[PDB]
Design a protein around this ligand. Structure first.
Ligand SMILES: COc1ccc(CCC(=O)O)cc1
Length: 139
């Protein structure tokens, strides 16, 4: 093998730590997360590790609430067990410079967008009319 080329998704690669969150409780309520799970999930300050190997992107969340890991190819649906224990069908695409992650379950949908802004990685979680913004910094 040879050394492969970079990609635009390289802007997301690295080790990230959650530094702020807004409206996450309301997001989780809109998603249907129960009280005890919401309270514990809302305290977490995960690290998030993003890596790329060929076509495969891996997003690992290391958390005091729940450790999750997804590996995927852009545009190709996969099964995901979310930190709050939903079993969802997920598709992640790159639209411009934004990773757009759609999760489908039980006739419901939620979208998680991930975008670089200055030195941060901003995550916006959307369920119907409810948005949560989560900001990560380099660890
Ligand atoms: C409730 O557990 C969750 C659900 C959604 C997320 C997406 C936002 C993020 O990764 O910071 C994280 C933890």
């Amino acid at each position: 093998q040879q050394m492969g080329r970079g990609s635009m998704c390289d802007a997301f690669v690295g080790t990230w730590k959650l530094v702020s969150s807004e409206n996450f409780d309301d997001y989780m309520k809109e998603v249907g997360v129960g009280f005890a799970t919401r309270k514990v999930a809302g305290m977490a300050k995960p690290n998030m590790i993003i890596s790329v190997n060929g076509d495969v992107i891996t997003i690992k969340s290391e958390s005091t609430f729940k450790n999750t890991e997804i590996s995927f190819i852009l545009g190709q649906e996969f099964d995901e067990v979310t930190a709050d224990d939903r079993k969802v069908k997920s598709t992640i695409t790159l639209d411009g410079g934004v990773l757009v992650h759609v999760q489908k379950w039980d006739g419901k949908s939620t979208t998680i967008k991930r975008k670089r802004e200055d030195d941060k990685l901003v995550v916006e979680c959307v369920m119907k009319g409810v948005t949560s913004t989560r900001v990560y910094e380099r660890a």
